[PDB]
Ligand binder design. Structure first.
Ligand SMILES: Nc1ncnc2c1ncn2[C@@H]1O[C@H](COP(=O)(O)OP(=O)(O)O)[C@@H](O)[C@H]1O
Ligand SMILES: [Mg+2]
Lengths: 116, 57, 239, 418, 471
C-alpha cells in the first residue's frame, strides 16, 4: 500500500510538472501581449507630450479640456491647476472659457476662474 | 434682594447664573463645612499624629 | 461594433467630502448627481486606493461600502473618485487557468486580463421563457448522490455541511469525477470562488485541480479568511 | 494644538471626542490629561468615537485628545523574552519600579523594551554597499542563554542599499545599528522596530504544517494531535482544565518560544506562571535553562480595562509572528478568546450597534477568522532563508458550558483541532 | 514618619456647583442638563424638596448632559425642585483602622449610634486592579475545619472561593463556621472579617451578627448591612465599600482579611435593574452583557501582594436560581473565582450537614497549597482517589436505581458502601466541630481501605505503601 501510494505521488509530481510548465507558457504569452499593449500606450504617451508641446495646436485642446471640466463641475467659481508652462496661455483665454461655459451650460457665464 | 439668613451665614456669598438655576454657595459656613470633610485626614494627623499600624499608603 | 463605444474619455469627479466612517461604510456629503450602485475609488491619506460601492443615495449624500475595509480612512485627506459605472469585470476566455483576488485582481503573477468585454458582476435575471429545464444527469461517481440525489447538468444544489466535516473533499471528488451518464458525443470548465476560507482549504482545492489537470480549465477567485470581509459580497458575483 | 480635540462624551470605555478632523480609523490617540491610549473606531464629521484601553473614570468633557497619527503597534527587538506586558505592550515589572505601587497607574508611559540594557550585537552577512530588503537578518544579539542569537531583522516594507553598518559591540536599543539609503533619503535603523498589531507581518510563503506540536498530554498527543503552525481551540465550562492545558503546553511543548496571553483572565494565573516558569527547565538548547527564558506574557486581567483585551490578543500574535520571522517555532496561547469576544460585545453595546447572535457584534466571526489566519508555518520574508511557525492555541469559555456559544461556533469553523 | 504628611492638600476648599436643572427621572436614573464640564464617574448629592440628601453616580456624560444613578432611589425626586450638587470627585470611603468593630449602612453610613469614621484616608471605592507582577500566588492553606473543604477543596489564604447555594440551604451556617474556625494549617494572628450584606433578610443579619458576637470576633469585624428592604441600587456599592475597606486593612495595615459578600445574586439583580433602566441590550437571562467584567472588578480584589504581609480571602455567597449552576450568576462567578463550594439541595434533604457536594466543587489553588512540606504527602492522591470513588459510587447508585442491587458488580457494591460512609461520616460534621486536615486525611484513608489497594489506581504506589496499611 505504501509503495502504491508513493508511485501515485510520483505520477502526480510528473503531471504537476507538466501542468506548471504549460501554465508558465500560457502566462508568458499573456505577458508578451500585455507588454505589446504597454508599448502602444507608451508611444501614445510620447505623442501626447509632443502635441502638448505644440502651443498653437495645443491651445484649442486646453480650452476644450477646461470647458469640459467646468461643465462637469457646474460651479459658479472654479480653480484651475495647470502646468507653469500654460498659466500664461490660460490667462489669455479666461474670457473665452467663461463665455463658452455659459453658452454650453445654457446658464449664466462662469463668475470667476482662479489659476492656482 | 433675597438676602442670606444671618443666623446661618456669617459671611461670604452665593453666586448664581442669570437664570438662577446654577449656584455656588461660597459662604464661610459652607466653606468650613467642606473643609471639615475633605480636610479630616490632615486634621487627624495633626492632632493624634501618625498611626502606628498603617505601613503603606 | 459595440466595443467601438469604448473609445471615449469620461473624466471623473474627485470629491474629498467624506463626512463619516463607521465600519464598512463611508458617508460622502456633497456629491453631484450621486448614482445608485456606482463604483468609486477611495484614495487614502497613505495613498493606497480602495474600491467601494454606493449603497444608497439621498440628494447630495452617498453611502459607500468599502470592500477592502475603512481602516486608515479619515475625513480630511481621503478623496473619493466616482467612476460613473457599476462594478464590471473584464472577461476573456484567457481567464481560464488563472487565479484572482476576491476582487478579481490576478494573484498568479500574470498580467491583468486583456478584456474582450467588461460585464456587470450583477448580471441580469434570465428570462424564464429562455430557460431550459435541466434533465441531463451528471455521474458525480458518488452513489449517495447519483442513485438517490441525482444531479442534472445545469442544477444548483449546495453541500450543506458543518465544521470538521469533509465537504471540501466531497466537492473536490464531485468536480473530479463529474460527467454525463450518456455523453452527448467534454470536461467541465470550473469556476471556483472561495469566501473566507482557510489557506489550507484553498491550497487543497488548487492542488487537487493541479493533480487532475483541470486547472487549465479553471478560474479561481480566492478570498481567504485573512482578506477583507466585505470583498466577499462581490467575489461570488465576479465568479 | 492642531492635533488636540476635546472630549465630548464619555460612557464606559467609549469616549467621543470633538474637533478631531484629520483622525484616521483605528488611529491611536491620547485621551485626557493623563494621555490614556485609545483607538478611533468611528468618525462622524469632526467627532471621533474612541475605545480607550484604560479606565475612563474621571475623564471630563473638554479634556484634551491628542492625535498621535499612528496605529496601535508593538516594539519588536531584544528584550521581549522573560517579560510580562499588560496588553498595550507596557512592562508590568517596570510599571512596578517606576510607580512604586502595587497597582498600574492610569496613563503611565513606559518604554516597551528596556533602553538601558546593552546588547552584544554582532553584524551579519550583509556589508556596506549591499542591497537589503525587509526581513533580512543583518545582525544578531545575545538576549539570554536560551535565545542565544536574537536575530536583528530589517523592518518589513523597508529597502535600499546599506550605507553604514555598526561593528560588533554593546549597544542600547536607541543606538543606531544600520543606515540604509533607498532614494537618496537615508533611514536609520536600531536594534528594534515598531509594527502595527492589526496588520499581520509578511512572509515569503505560507507552508503546510507537518511536524507535531507535542503538548506532553497523552490524550492530545495520541488521539487529537496538533501540528507546529496549527490552530487549536479548547472549549469548556469553568473548572474543565483549559488553563492547565495551556500552561502544560507552555511548559513542555517542543516550541522554541511561547507567547502566553492571559486575556480577560485571573491575575493569579499570571502570578503562578511567573512563579513557576523560572523553576522549570528545558533541554531544547542542549543544556538545562529556565523556560521563562523563552516565554513572554501579555496579561489583561478580567478586572483590567475591557477594551485592552483586544489589544492584548493583537499584541500577542504580533510578538509570535515576530519570532516566527526569526526561524523559531512559536506557540501563542490565547486564554481566553471568549473574553476578547466579550470585550468586543461590550464596546459594541456602548456604541449602540445592532447585536448579532447572543448580543455579539456582527463582525466577530470575521475578526476571529482573520486572527486565526495569522498562525501557520511560513518561510521568513528576508534572507538567509529560514522557516518558522506560529501555533495558536485558544481557550474558549462558552457561556454556561454550552458549545452553541457564538464564539465556540465561529472558532470551530475556523480552527483545525477541537 | 513624614509619609503621612503627604495627606497635605487635604486642607483645601473646593466650592461646588449646585444645579437646579434636572430634566428627567427614569427609575434608578436622573438626567441633568446644562452641566459645566461634567466628570465621567463623578459623585453628586441630590437634595430633594423635603430636605433629604441622596447620592448618585454619573453614569454617562455627553456635552452638558449627565446621567446619574441614585443609590437610594429616585422616589420623591422631581424635575422641578430637586437640586444636584457636583462634588468633582468619585465615590470615596473614609478608612481607618477604627472601622473594625463597626456596623454601617449599605452606603457606608454608621448605624451603631456611633460617630462618623474619623477618616485616616479617603479611598476610591472602585480601587485599582492589582499589578499581576506585584501579586503573590497564594499557597498558605487555611484549615476551615470542614473535612469536605480541607481535604478536597483546600482553600489557600488569599483565595477567592464562593459558596454556591440556594434559597433554603444552610450556606449562612457554613460561612459562619468557616469564619469561626479558619486559620493556617501551619501557623507562624486572627482574621479580620469584613462582612457585606446585599439584600439579606433581617434573619440573616441577626444570625451573622449574633454568631460574630458570640465568637468574639465582632471586635475585629466591620459590617456593611444592606437589607432586603433597603434601596436596591445601593447594593451596587455595598461590595465595593467593603472590599475597599479590606484592601485598606490588608494591604496598607498588614492585616489578614476574610471578606464575606452575602448574596451576590442580589447584587446581580441590582445590576440587571440598572441595565434595564439604561435601555441596554440584555444578556443571557436578562443580565447585562458586561456582568462578567463587573463581577471581576469585585472578585479580583483579593489575594496577596509582594512586600506586604496582609491578604484578602473572599468568600462570596451566591444563591443559584432554581439550583441551576449554569445560570449566569453562578456561571460567570465560576469563570472569575478560584473555585467554588457547592451546597447541594439533595444532600440537604438527606439530612447531611454541611450539605457540600464535592463533585461540583473546586479549589483552583489546592494543587499548590497542599503537599509534603505544607500538609502531608498523601493529601493530593487521597483527594483525587476520594473524588474518583465518589463519582463511581454515584454512578453505581444510578445503576442500582434501574437494575437493582443484585445485579451490581463487586466494585460497584464497594463504591456504594463508600458512598454511604463518605456522606454520613466524612462529609457529615458538627456545626461546631473542627477537624484538623491530618484528622480528615485519617478519615479519608479509612474510607479508601473499603477497597483493595489494587483498586486505588489514582494513589501513587509509594503513597499507597506508606499509608494504606498504616492502620
Ligand atoms: N490536567 C490536569 N491535571 C490535574 N489537575 C488539573 C488538570 N486540569 C485541571 N486541574 C485541576 O482543576 C483546576 C481547574 O482547572 P483550570 O485550569 O483552572 O480550568 P478552567 O480554565 O477551565 O477554569 C486546576 O486548578 C487543577 O486543580
Ligand atoms: Mg480559563
Amino acid at each position: 500500500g505504501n509503495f502504491k501510494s508513493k508511485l501515485k505521488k510520483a505520477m502526480l509530481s510528473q503531471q504537476i510538472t507538466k501542468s506548471t510548465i504549460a501554465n508558465k507558457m500560457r502566462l508568458k504569452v499573456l505577458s508578451a501581449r500585455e507588454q505589446s499593449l504597454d508599448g502602444i500606450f507608451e508611444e501614445t504617451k510620447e505623442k501626447l507630450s509632443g502635441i502638448a508641446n505644440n502651443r498653437d495646436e495645443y491651445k484649442p485642446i486646453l480650452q476644450s479640456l477646461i470647458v469640459e471640466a467646468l461643465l462637469k463641475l457646474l460651479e459658479p467659481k472654479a480653480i484651475v491647476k495647470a502646468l507653469e508652462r500654460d498659466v500664461d496661455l490660460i490667462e489669455s483665454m479666461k474670457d473665452d472659457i467663461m463665455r463658452e461655459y455659459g453658452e454650453k451650460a445654457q446658464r449664466a457665464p462662469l463668475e470667476e476662474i482662479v489659476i492656482s | 434682594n433675597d438676602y442670606l439668613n444671618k443666623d446661618l451665614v456669617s459671611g461670604g456669598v452665593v453666586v448664581s447664573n442669570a437664570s438662577d438655576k446654577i449656584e455656588i454657595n461660597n459662604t464661610l459656613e459652607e466653606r468650613l463645612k467642606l473643609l471639615s470633610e475633605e480636610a479630616l485626614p490632615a486634621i487627624r494627623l495633626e492632632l493624634y499624629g501618625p498611626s502606628k499600624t498603617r505601613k503603606f499608603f | 461594433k459595440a466595443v467601438e463605444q469604448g473609445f471615449n474619455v469620461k473624466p471623473r469627479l474627485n470629491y474629498n467630502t467624506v463626512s463619516g466612517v463607521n465600519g464598512p461604510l463611508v458617508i460622502l456629503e456633497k456629491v453631484k448627481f450621486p448614482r445608485y450602485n456606482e463604483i468609486v475609488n477611495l484614495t487614502l491619506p497613505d495613498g493606497t486606493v480602495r474600491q467601494g460601492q454606493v449603497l444608497e443615495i439621498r440628494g447630495d449624500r452617498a453611502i459607500v461600502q468599502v470592500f477592502e475595509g475603512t481602516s486608515g480612512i479619515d475625513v480630511k485627506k481621503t478623496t473619493v473618485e466616482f467612476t460613473g459605472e457599476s462594478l464590471r469585470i473584464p472577461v476573456s476566455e484567457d481567464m481560464l487557468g488563472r487565479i484572482f483576488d476576491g476582487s478579481g485582481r490576478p494573484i498568479d503573477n500574470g498580467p491583468k486580463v486583456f478584456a474582450e468585454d467588461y460585464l456587470d458582476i450583477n448580471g441580469s435575471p434570465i428570462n424564464p421563457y429562455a430557460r431550459i429545464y435541466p434533465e441531463e444527469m451528471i455521474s458525480t461517481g458518488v452513489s449517495a448522490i447519483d442513485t438517490m440525489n441525482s444531479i442534472a447538468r445545469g442544477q444548483k444544489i449546495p453541500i450543506f455541511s458543518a465544521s470538521g466535516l469533509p465537504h471540501n473533499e466531497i466537492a473536490a471528488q464531485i468536480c473530479r469525477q463529474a460527467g454525463l451518464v450518456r455523453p452527448t458525443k467534454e470536461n467541465f470548465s470550473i469556476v471556483f470562488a472561495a469566501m473566507g476560507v482557510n489557506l489550507e482549504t484553498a491550497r487543497f482545492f488548487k492542488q487537487d485541480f493541479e493533480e487532475n489537470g483541470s486547472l487549465e480549465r479553471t478560474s479561481l477567485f480566492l478570498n481567504l479568511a485573512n482578506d477583507p470581509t466585505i470583498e466577499r459580497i462581490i467575489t461570488p458575483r465576479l465568479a | 494644538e492642531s492635533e488636540y480635540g476635546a472630549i465630548y462624551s464619555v460612557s464606559g470605555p467609549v469616549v467621543i471626542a470633538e474637533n478631531m478632523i484629520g483622525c484616521a480609523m483605528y488611529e491611536l490617540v491620547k485621551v485626557g490629561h493623563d494621555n490614556l491610549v485609545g483607538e478611533v473606531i468611528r468618525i462622524d464629521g469632526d467627532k471621533a468615537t474612541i475605545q480607550v484601553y484604560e479606565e475612563t473614570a474621571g475623564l471630563t468633557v473638554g479634556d484634551p485628545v491628542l492625535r498621535t497619527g499612528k496605529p496601535l503597534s508593538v516594539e519588536l527587538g531584544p528584550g521581549l523574552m522573560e517579560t510580562i506586558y499588560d496588553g498595550i505592550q507596557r512592562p508590568l515589572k517596570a510599571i512596578k519600579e517606576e510607580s512604586q505601587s502595587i497597582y498600574i497607574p492610569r496613563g503611565i508611559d513606559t518604554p516597551a523594551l528596556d533602553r538601558t540594557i546593552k546588547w552584544q550585537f554582532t553584524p551579519g552577512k550583509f556589508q556596506v554597499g549591499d542591497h537589503i530588503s525587509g526581513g533580512d537578518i543583518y545582525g544578531s544579539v545575545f538576549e539570554n542563554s536560551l535565545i542565544s542569537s536574537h536575530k536583528i531583522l530589517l523592518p518589513p516594507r523597508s529597502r535600499g542599499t546599506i550605507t553604514w553598518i555598526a561593528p560588533a559591540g554593546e549597544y542600547t536599543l536607541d543606538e543606531k545599528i544600520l543606515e540604509v539609503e533607498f532614494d537618496g533619503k537615508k533611514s536609520d535603523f536600531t536594534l528594534y522596530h515598531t509594527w502595527p498589531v492589526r496588520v499581520p507581518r509578511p512572509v515569503t510563503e505560507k507552508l503546510s504544517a507537518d511536524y507535531p506540536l507535542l503538548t506532553g498530554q497523552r490524550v492530545l498527543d495520541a488521539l487529537f494531535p496538533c501540528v507546529q503552525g496549527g490552530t487549536t481551540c479548547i472549549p469548556g465550562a469553568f473548572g474543565c482544565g483549559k488553563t492547565v492545558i495551556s500552561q502544560s503546553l507552555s511548559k513542555y511543548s517542543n516550541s522554541d518560544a511561547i507567547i502566553y496571553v492571559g486575556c480577560g483572565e485571573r491575575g493569579n494565573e499570571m502570578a503562578e506562571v511567573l512563579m513557576e516558569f523560572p523553576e522549570l527547565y528545558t533541554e531544547m538548547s542542549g543544556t538545562k535553562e529556565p523556560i521563562m527564558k523563552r516565554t513572554t506574557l501579555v496579561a489583561n486581567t478580567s478586572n483590567m480595562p475591557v477594551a485592552a483585551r483586544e489589544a492584548s490578543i493583537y499584541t500577542g500574535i504580533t510578538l509570535a509572528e515576530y519570532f516566527r520571522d526569526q526561524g523559531k517555532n512559536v506557540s501563542m496561547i490565547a486564554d481566553s478568546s471568549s473574553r476578547w469576544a466579550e470585550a468586543l460585545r461590550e464596546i459594541s453595546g456602548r456604541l449602540g450597534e445592532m447585536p448579532a447572535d447572543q448580543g455579539f457584534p456582527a463582525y466577530l466571526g470575521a475578526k476571529l477568522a482573520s486572527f486565526y489566519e495569522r498562525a501557520g508555518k511560513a518561510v521568513a520574508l528576508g534572507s538567509p532563508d529560514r522557516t518558522g511557525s506560529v501555533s495558536i492555541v485558544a481557550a474558549v469559555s462558552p457561556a454556561g458550558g454550552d458549545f452553541s456559544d457564538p464564539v465556540t461556533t465561529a472558532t470551530l469553523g475556523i480552527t483545525q483541532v477541537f | 514618619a513624614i509619609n503621612k504628611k503627604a495627606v497635605e492638600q487635604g486642607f483645601n476648599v473646593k466650592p461646588r456647583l449646585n444645579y437646579n436643572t434636572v430634566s428627567g427621572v427614569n427609575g434608578p436614573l436622573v438626567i441633568l442638563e446644562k452641566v459645566k464640564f461634567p466628570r465621567y464617574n463623578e459623585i453628586v448629592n441630590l437634595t430633594l424638596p423635603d430636605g433629604t440628601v441622596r447620592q448618585g453616580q454619573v453614569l454617562e456624560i455627553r456635552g452638558d448632559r449627565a446621567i446619574v444613578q441614585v443609590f437610594e432611589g429616585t422616589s420623591g425626586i422631581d424635575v422641578k425642585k430637586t437640586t444636584v450638587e457636583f462634588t468633582g470627585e468619585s465615590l470615596r470611603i473614609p478608612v481607618s483602622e477604627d472601622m473594625l468593630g463597626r456596623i454601617f449602612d449599605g452606603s457606608g453610613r454608621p448605624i451603631d449610634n456611633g460617630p462618623k469614621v474619623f477618616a485616616e484616608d479617603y479611598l476610591d471605592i472602585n480601587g485599582s486592579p492589582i499589578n499581576p507582577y506585584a501579586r503573590i500566588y497564594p499557597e498558605e492553606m487555611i484549615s476551615t475545619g470542614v473535612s469536605a473543604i480541607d481535604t478536597m477543596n483546600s482553600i489557600a489564604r488569599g483565595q477567592k472561593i464562593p459558596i454556591f447555594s440556594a434559597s433554603g440551604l444552610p450556606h449562612n451556617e457554613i460561612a459562619a463556621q468557616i469564619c469561626r474556625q479558619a486559620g493556617l494549617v501551619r501557623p507562624t494572628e486572627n482574621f479580620s472579617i469584613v462582612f457585606a450584606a446585599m439584600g439579606v433578610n433581617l434573619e440573616t443579619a441577626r444570625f451573622f451578627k449574633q454568631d460574630f458576637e458570640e465568637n468574639g470576633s465582632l471586635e475585629r469585624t466591620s459590617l456593611f448591612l444592606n437589607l432586603a428592604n433597603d434601596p436596591t441600587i445601593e447594593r451596587i456599592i455595598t461590595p465595593r465599600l467593603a472590599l475597599t475597606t479590606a484592601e485598606y486593612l490588608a494591604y496598607q495595615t498588614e492585616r489578614h482579611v476574610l471578606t464575606i459578600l452575602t448574596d451576590m445574586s442580589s447584587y446581580a439583580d441590582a445590576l440587571r435593574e440598572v441595565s434595564a433602566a439604561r435601555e441596554e441590550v440584555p444578556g443571557r437571562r436578562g443580565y447585562p452583557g458586561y456582568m462578567y467584567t463587573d463581577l471581576s472588578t469585585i472578585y479580583e480584589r483579593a489575594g496577596r501582594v509582594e512586600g506586604r504581609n496582609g491578604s484578602i480571602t473572599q468568600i462570596p455567597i451566591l444563591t443559584m436560581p432554581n439550583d441551576d449552576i449554569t445560570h449566569p450568576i453562578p456561571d460567570l462567578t465560576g469563570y472569575i473565582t478560584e473555585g467554588q463550594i457547592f451546597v447541594d439541595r439533595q444532600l440537604h434533604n438527606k439530612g447531611i450537614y454541611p450539605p457540600i457536594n464535592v463533585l461540583p466543587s473546586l479549589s483552583r489553588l489546592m494543587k499548590s497549597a497542599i503537599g509534603e512540606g505544607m500538609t502531608r504527602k498523601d493529601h493530593g492522591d487521597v483527594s483525587n482517589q476520594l473524588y474518583a470513588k465518589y463519582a463511581i459510587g454515584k454512578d453505581a447508585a444510578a445503576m442500582k436505581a434501574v437494575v437493582g442491587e443484585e445485579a451490581l458488580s463487586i466494585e460497584d457494591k464497594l463504591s456504594l458502601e463508600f458512598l454511604e460512609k463518605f456522606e454520613k461520616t466524612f462529609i457529615t460534621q458538627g456545626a461546631y466541630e473542627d477537624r484538623t486536615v491530618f484528622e480528615s486525611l485519617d478519615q479519608a484513608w479509612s474510607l479508601l481501605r473499603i477497597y483493595p489497594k489494587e483498586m486505588l489506581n489514582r494513589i501513587s504506589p509509594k503513597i499507597l505503601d506508606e499509608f494504606y496499611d498504616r492502620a
